[PDB]
């Protein structure tokens, strides 16, 4: 039923030279991010900071969509313009986070699972009425923990169950099984684990009859572990990540937007840039949170007189990644 | 952390000549029961009924556990002593339904899945503090619908997830993948579907490292469909059901407490009785709702003068199924 | 060790404007072919007929590989030089059928499974010594039987086992889970069963660490059932087939060479040509047996005087399908 | 024609109280090594004479219910001319046959094996049935030092379950042997975990394949520490761990469980089995030994015809000891 709509949303978000701005922090997380610049965590300050982001001048050139938190999806500018309505003209599609976060998985050794399927069909339905057109759900696997068979299983199984519920409510599911950076593992181990979790996630989605034309992928890049002494330059990170994707994603999938996951901003930019010297079977873009935002918070410093310079910092980094999306950096 | 208590609780519930009184009706559903006897669905009427059940004078000889609704777990008698404190003085284990019900499963043709995992760890911890010691979670499969691959998968997967979450919270999980009566299927088709869903549920439970010595099962018996041509008496249903169990339940599982699911009060007792003519590798007993308490509602009729006769009817139907648990049922 | 050469071979076989000629008939099956044109099934008439195919003068222009039977891989021309050397001179890669055929699967109601894993590692190692560079293994699923869970499972499980064995022996595996035409099923049901069996096959192949850059696919096209009323033009088989391939095959797979399987010598060309109107993420071509061989059989009639006209009949229908690989066919 | 009733009868005959299986299915190469150990030439006649010695031991049938034969021995006769199958029929011993084709490196694993044999297995078992065989054997393995890997464990479970359905359809009761190897330093807990997983997997695939559990036999390794583990395990602990594993994974429909020795002394093999039979079990827990029954026979025979009766006495002494251990009455 939503088939035409889902394919349309996915194509808009998977546009050339455009990526996603992730802004779906919890009220508490946005609070910890606001006190880094000494700003009190009120609903007005969160609303003001979110308005600052969505009204940045030329965002729509480099940002095709924005992942909002539930509170922000209903908020408006001080002018009175609904936030989703401001995004619509910069041709930025409104998305929202729908998972309920990570919880200890029983009978593992410190591994996590992502909850949120209870009531998810109703919640996604209301988010669709409110203007949201794609969803986001993040689950993780830990190489230092294996991952175990059952932890990798629930990450992939939960995602495929979520992808079907999201599409049936009119929301393009973003499928994020994040292979975490934790550990000393080399790039070959992360390639192995990425190939396994994607093969497993895609198998369950096929089982659930998810329409691949109407989904987007948010993977981590194939990189060595955070504590691995053997590092990897942008050329290697590009070669290892592209072969992984070519081995696991069918061409029916329109877009693939990487997470930063603890890289630089420049590393996140060079690595993406090194992947777009050639054509790709799908749109290989970006979907960053801190990588696009940390420049803005410390430039803004809560002072309304620094708003324009902060919104300018947002565009400098959003354009730098759009330059990378086309290899023009 | 709770391993030995789970084993101790499972052995008290799956004890000789005892079974479970399923009392976990919704506020809405318990209202339907009360309307069937012309009693208005108020909180005091529901509380009065639940007090009538758990305060029946001799229930501890035949009932080993009672599945409570979340509201009932915290209620007390009119005299002011707690239900769970009533049950323990009769060596009845308080249990709690912890699932959040059935919901259409996306991209199937009318099939449902059972939700409730979100926050389940915290709810079971609170139910444990309140004195509950076992839990219940009901998922279903429909033979008219197949069931489909992904529907049976989620029935087994969700139950195995729930079983691990409950054991880590200290609640013995009752595992209920009910194969529904609906359809025209014969008893061979029901046995085939039962064997598949139990093989899938036990594989996932093994994967999740569930401790089989601390679980209880609540299957449907192996019967022909509700709308099936040929029918099966107590001896054939006992034969088909025991075959299913012998082929799929490992001996470490201490107890198997069946649901009635749409048979008469008498049929439920006779089927259970026919399964206990010879010893079994596990305790084969009952977990009955509409069977055990149907006669209590009609004897009560909401009238305080009928309280004692309604409790006597409960003990009589409880004593029948306890006799059936030992293959000693005398229907005279 | 064979990683680099497997990638080269898969690219050579997946060249553009080229497909594979399947000539892997058993001695008994090929004898059935010669009896239909009144020819006696001896080893020399089989060798003579296979020489007629391998020695067609232009062949190596529309044909990149040829699937051989185990006997033909070792026999030479009348001159005395090995058939495998003719193929290399024509830039055609020698292939080899490596399965041991279909057998009833236990506890199914009439479903089959494909034998061959026993000794396969040693069998492929010697075929590589004999100059073969790719392999073929055909398993089936039957919509009229479901297919059942365990029947589809073994089809995908065996193919993924074989693919890993063939690669470690140096042969590019051709992966052929054939969804049979049998039954009255429509195109949507064939679409559903095709998507399932390929999801299962690729999952197992991923578990087995099969290198997707060095494999080839031989699927059945997405069509209604042989006994189904609603037909399908080249336009809609093309869009049903390509959407299923795009929903299941990862871009790393170099080539997809289809089987004709009882369509028509005409229809096989129209369908393939319709799938090459636009660029594809992989080389979508043809792997045909009778659609290239049958008019060769009936023109040769076993008489040596018609060798030239029968070899010409081979090339004429080869180019018809090669032009279909380019979307440029009359 | 359907063998369901004969399969059940065979399985119950082979899994009979006080009896176990003599495994004597060594290949010509392997039995040659055995004959060399006592310094005897590996001729076809010496293999036939050693096999005659074992099968013809007087009264062996009181302790041995079945004998796994190699393909060659299944068709051989005594020197006087009586077929070995007829000797075993007079001895009340069921003939069985090894049907797998040995271990082979599994592709893309780091040094792991799989067991081949499915090709032609249906015809082979059909011919073995006509020759008198009534049960079959298939040995697959998993390495703990290698994990085992997911695909190595999968093929072991998957091939066994496929072989079990083929065998039953041909009239042979399948002995299901996924051996967890002794290799490594792993402790008994790691063995337990790997045993539990491979049996959960093997039983799932078999349930999928509609294998009839009433007509199969199991041949597991015991649950013991690895060969190089520094923490050991006496008979009581081996029994506790092994029976827990079986209770948690083997459905009661399975009639018999016949352990391999796989690297234990004769005495510890007997004491381990004896410790598992101090109380009743839901299935017959017995033995399926090769070297633990044969090594003293070869060492006593020495190839010399004058030592035949002393070698047969040696076989009977060991078979009786394990038959006693099966009843728990070895020490007493
Ligand atoms: Cl260890």
Report the 10 Å Cβ neighbour count for A97: 24
Task: Look up residue A126 and give its two tokens.
Answer: 């209301």
Nearest in space to A13 (alpha carbons), one of A136, A192, A193: A136
Radius of gyration of chain A (CA): 19
Helices (H), C146-226: 149-169, 187-207
Which residue in D219, D232, D240, D320 is the catalytic one? D219
d(CA B70, CA B75): 9
Cβ proximity of D253 and D213 under 8 Å:
yes
Name residues whose C-beta falls within 8 Å of residue B321's C-beta, 6 or more positions apart in sequence: B19, B62, B268, B269, B272, B285, B286, B288, B291, B292
Q: Determine whether the interchain pair C249/A250 forms a contact, defined as Cβ–Cβ distance below 8 Å.
A: yes
Helices (H), chain A: 3-13, 27-34, 43-54, 70-73, 83-89, 120-129, 149-168, 187-207, 234-248, 266-274, 290-300, 307-325
d(CA A318, CA A61): 9
Q: Determine whether the interchain pair A154/B161 forms a contact, defined as Cβ–Cβ distance below 8 Å.
A: yes
Q: How far is CA A3 from CA A168, A170, A171, C285, in A?
A: 9, 8, 10, 30
- Tell me whether B203 touches chain D (CB under 8 Å): yes
The Cα of A281 is separated from the nearest Cα of chain C by a number of Å equal to 7
Provide φ and ψ at D8, rounded to 5°: -60, -45
Cβ proximity of A321 and A268 under 8 Å:
yes
**Which of C118, C161, C168 has its CB closest to that of D119?**
C118
Q: What is the resolution of this structure in A?
A: 2.4
- Tell me whether A239 touches chain C (CB under 8 Å): no
d(CA C186, CA C70): 37
Give the A:B interface size as CB pairs under 8 Å: 55
- Distance of CA D186 from the midpoint of ligand 1 (Å): 4
Name residues whose C-beta falls within 8 Å of residue C323's C-beta, 6 or more positions apart in sequence: C17, C269, C273, C329, C330
d(CA D93, CA D73): 15
Helix (H) and strand (E) counts in chain A? 12, 10
The Cα of B159 is separated from the nearest Cα of chain A by a number of Å equal to 13
**DSSP code, position A64:** E
- Tell me whether C208 touches chain D (CB under 8 Å): yes
- Tell me whether B251 touches chain D (CB under 8 Å): yes
- Tell me whether A38 touches chain B (CB under 8 Å): no
Q: How far is CA C320 from CA A43, B83, B310, C19, C57, in A?
A: 70, 84, 87, 11, 16
Q: Determine whether the interchain pair B243/D253 forms a contact, defined as Cβ–Cβ distance below 8 Å.
A: yes
Name residues whose C-beta falls within 8 Å of residue A79's C-beta, 6 or more positions apart in sequence: none
C122 is catalytic: no
Radius of gyration of chain D (CA): 19
Burial category of A79 from C-beta neighbours within 10 Å (exposed 0-12, middle 13-18, buried 19 and up): exposed
Cβ proximity of D289 and D20 under 8 Å:
yes
Name residues whose C-beta falls within 8 Å of residue D68's C-beta, 6 or more positions apart in sequence: D21, D22, D23, D24, D25, D96, D97, D98, D137, D175, D288
Nearest in space to A309 (alpha carbons), one of A318, A297, A321, A319: A297
Contacts of D105 in chain C (CB under 8 A): 121
Longest dimension (CA), chain B: 54
Cβ proximity of A6 and A214 under 8 Å:
yes
Per DSSP, the three-state class of A91 is: coil
Name residues whose C-beta falls within 8 Å of residue B277's C-beta, 6 or more positions apart in sequence: B238, B327
d(CA B169, CA B121): 7
Cβ proximity of A272 and A287 under 8 Å:
no
Q: From A243, which residue of chain C is nearest by alpha-carbon distance? A: C252
Q: Determine whether the interchain pair D162/C154 forms a contact, defined as Cβ–Cβ distance below 8 Å.
A: yes
Q: Among all chains, which residue has been given the structure tokens 């049901």?
A: C189
Q: How far is CA D34 from CA A200, C34, D302, D304, D307, in A?
A: 48, 54, 11, 15, 17
Cβ proximity of C49 and C3 under 8 Å:
no
- Tell me whether A149 touches chain B (CB under 8 Å): yes
Which residues have CB less than 5 Å away from ligand 1 (the ion)? Answer: D 186-187, 190
Nearest in space to A62 (alpha carbons), one of A322, A325, A326, A324: A322
Helices (H), D215-307: 235-249, 266-275, 291-301
- Tell me whether D213 touches chain B (CB under 8 Å): yes
Cβ proximity of C143 and C132 under 8 Å:
no
Burial category of D22 from C-beta neighbours within 10 Å (exposed 0-12, middle 13-18, buried 19 and up): buried
Cβ proximity of A163 and A203 under 8 Å:
no
Method: X-ray
Q: From A118, which residue of chain B is nearest by alpha-carbon distance? A: B115
DSSP per-residue string spanning B120-178: HHHHHHHHHHTT--EEEEEEEE-STT---HHHHHHHHHHHHHHHHHHHHHT-EEEEEEE
d(CA D217, CA D209): 16
User: Chains with 3 or more CB pairs closer than 8 angstroms to A?
Assistant: B, C
Nearest in space to C234 (alpha carbons), one of C222, C218, C220, C245: C222
The Cα of C148 is separated from the nearest Cα of chain D by a number of Å equal to 10
**DSSP code, position C105:** P
Name residues whose C-beta falls within 8 Å of residue C79's C-beta, 6 or more positions apart in sequence: none
Strands (E), B254-293: 255-258, 283-288
CA A320 to chain centre: 17
Q: Determine whether the interchain pair A106/B149 forms a contact, defined as Cβ–Cβ distance below 8 Å.
A: no
- Distance of CA A53 from the midpoint of ligand 1 (Å): 53
Task: Look up residue A54 and give its two tokens.
Answer: 């969505």
Nearest in space to C92 (alpha carbons), one of C166, C18, C170, C171: C18
Provide φ and ψ at A131, rounded to 5°: 105, -5
Handedness of CA A179, A185, A187, A191 (dihedral sign): negative
Burial category of A190 from C-beta neighbours within 10 Å (exposed 0-12, middle 13-18, buried 19 and up): buried
Task: Look up residue C60 and give its two tokens.
Answer: 């190596």
**Which of D201, D208, D247 has its CB closest to that of B250?**
D247
Cβ proximity of C31 and C44 under 8 Å:
no
Provide φ and ψ at C197, rounded to 5°: -65, -30
**Which of D116, D122, D150 has its CB closest to that of C118?**
D116
CA D35 to chain centre: 21
Q: Which residues of C are annotated as a binding site?
A: 46, 136
Burial category of A78 from C-beta neighbours within 10 Å (exposed 0-12, middle 13-18, buried 19 and up): exposed
d(CA C128, CA C120): 12
d(CA D257, CA D247): 12
- Distance of CA B147 from the midpoint of ligand 1 (Å): 41
- Tell me whether A207 touches chain B (CB under 8 Å): yes
Half-sphere exposure of D172 (CA within 13 A, CB side): 33
Task: Look up residue D64 and give its two tokens.
Answer: 């041995």
Handedness of CA A204, A209, A212, A218 (dihedral sign): negative
C-alpha dihedral, C43 to C48 to C51 to C53, nearest 10°: -110
- Distance of CA D164 from the midpoint of ligand 1 (Å): 32
Cβ proximity of B180 and B223 under 8 Å:
no
Per DSSP, the three-state class of D149 is: coil
Q: Determine whether the interchain pair A150/B115 forms a contact, defined as Cβ–Cβ distance below 8 Å.
A: no
Q: Determine whether the interchain pair D122/C104 forms a contact, defined as Cβ–Cβ distance below 8 Å.
A: yes
Q: Among all chains, which residue has been given the structure tokens 């195995």?
A: B160
Which residue in A25, A111, A218, A319 is the catalytic one? A218
Nearest in space to D7 (alpha carbons), one of D245, D167, D196: D167
Please state whether beta strands A112-114 and A102-104 pair in parallel, antiparallel, or not at all (unpaired).
antiparallel
Q: How far is CA A101 from CA A104, A136, A259, D98, in A?
A: 10, 11, 17, 54
Task: Look up residue A154 and give its two tokens.
Answer: 């629930």
Residues in chain B, total: 332
Contacts of D248 in chain B (CB under 8 A): 206, 212-213, 250, 252
- Tell me whether C81 touches chain A (CB under 8 Å): no
- Distance of CA A186 from the midpoint of ligand 1 (Å): 25
Q: Determine whether the interchain pair D165/C106 forms a contact, defined as Cβ–Cβ distance below 8 Å.
A: yes
Contacts of D162 in chain C (CB under 8 A): 106, 154
Which residue in C25, C51, C176, C178 is the catalytic one? C176
**Which of C116, C149, C154 has its CB closest to that of D119?**
C116
Provide φ and ψ at A187, rounded to 5°: -70, -30
d(CA B160, CA B67): 20
Q: How far is CA D111 from CA B320, C7, D144, D264, in A?
A: 61, 25, 12, 25
Nearest in space to B284 (alpha carbons), one of B200, B219, B199: B219
Q: Among all chains, which residue has been given the structure tokens 């009833």?
A: C104
Cis peptide, bond prior to residue D257, ω within 30 of zero:
no
| Interface mutation target, options B247, B254, B256, chain D, most CBs of D under 10 Å | B247
Give the C:D interface size as CB pairs under 8 Å: 55
Q: Determine whether the interchain pair B247/D250 forms a contact, defined as Cβ–Cβ distance below 8 Å.
A: no
Number of domains in chain C: 1
Give the B:D interface size as CB pairs under 8 Å: 49
Q: Determine whether the interchain pair C251/A251 forms a contact, defined as Cβ–Cβ distance below 8 Å.
A: yes
Nearest in space to A105 (alpha carbons), one of A58, A50, A164, A148: A148
Cβ proximity of B296 and B36 under 8 Å:
no
**Which of C106, C121, C207 has its CB closest to that of D169?**
C106
- Tell me whether B212 touches chain D (CB under 8 Å): yes
Q: Determine whether the interchain pair C118/D101 forms a contact, defined as Cβ–Cβ distance below 8 Å.
A: yes
d(CA B2, CA B168): 7
Strand partners, D21: D66, D288
Residues in chain D, total: 332
B218 is catalytic: yes
Which residue in B25, B176, B178, B200 is the catalytic one? B176
Q: Determine whether the interchain pair A107/B154 forms a contact, defined as Cβ–Cβ distance below 8 Å.
A: no
CA D25 to chain centre: 9
- Distance of CA C259 from the midpoint of ligand 1 (Å): 51
Provide φ and ψ at B267, rounded to 5°: -55, -40
B319 is in an annotated binding site: no
d(CA B183, CA B225): 5
For C83, left (φ over 0), alpha (ψ -120 to 50), or beta?
alpha
d(CA C85, CA C82): 5
| Interface mutation target, options D99, D111, D113, D119, chain C, most CBs of C under 10 Å | D119
Domain that holds residue B67: 1-332
For residue D31, give the H/E element and its range.
helix D28-37
Q: Among all chains, which residue has been given the structure tokens 């993420």?
A: C281
Per DSSP, the three-state class of D89 is: helix
Q: From C210, which residue of chain A is nearest by alpha-carbon distance? A: A247
């Amino acid at each position: 039923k939503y088939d035409e709509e889902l394919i349309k949303t996915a194509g808009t978000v998977a546009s050339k030279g455009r990526g996603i701005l992730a802004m779906d922090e919890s009220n508490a997380t946005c609070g910890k991010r606001l006190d880094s610049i000494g700003v009190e965590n009120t609903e007005e300050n969160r609303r003001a900071y979110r308005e600052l982001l969505v009204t940045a001048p030329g965002l729509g050139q480099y940002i095709s969509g924005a992942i909002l938190f539930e509170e922000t999806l209903y908020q408006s500018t001080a002018s009175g313009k609904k936030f989703v309505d401001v995004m619509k003209e910069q041709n930025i599609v409104p998305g929202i986070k729908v998972d309920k976060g990570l919880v200890p998985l029983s009978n593992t050794n410190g591994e996590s699972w992502c909850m949120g399927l209870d009531g998810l069909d109703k919640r996604c339905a209301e988010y669709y009425k409110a203007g949201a057109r794609f969803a986001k759900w993040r689950s993780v696997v830990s190489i230092p923990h294996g991952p175990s068979i059952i932890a990798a299983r629930d990450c992939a199984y939960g995602l495929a169950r979520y992808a079907a519920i999201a599409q049936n409510a009119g929301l393009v599911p973003i499928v994020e099984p994040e292979v975490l950076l934790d550990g000393e593992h080399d790039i070959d181990r992360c390639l192995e684990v990425q190939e396994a979790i994607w093969a497993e996630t895609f198998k369950y989605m096929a089982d659930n009859k998810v329409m691949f034309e109407g989904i987007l992928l948010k993977p981590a890049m194939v990189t060595p572990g955070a504590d691995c002494k053997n590092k990897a330059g942008p050329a290697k990170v590009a070669e290892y990540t592209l072969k992984m994707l070519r081995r696991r994603v069918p061409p029916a999938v329109p877009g693939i937007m990487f997470l930063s996951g603890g890289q630089s901003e420049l590393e996140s930019t060079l690595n993406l840039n090194a992947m777009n010297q050639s054509p790709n079977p799908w749109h290989v873009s970006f979907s960053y949170a801190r990588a696009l935002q940390n420049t803005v918070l410390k430039t803004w410093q809560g002072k309304p007189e620094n708003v324009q310079a902060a919104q300018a910092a947002l565009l400098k980094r959003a354009k730098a990644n759009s330059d990378a999306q086309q290899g023009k950096y």
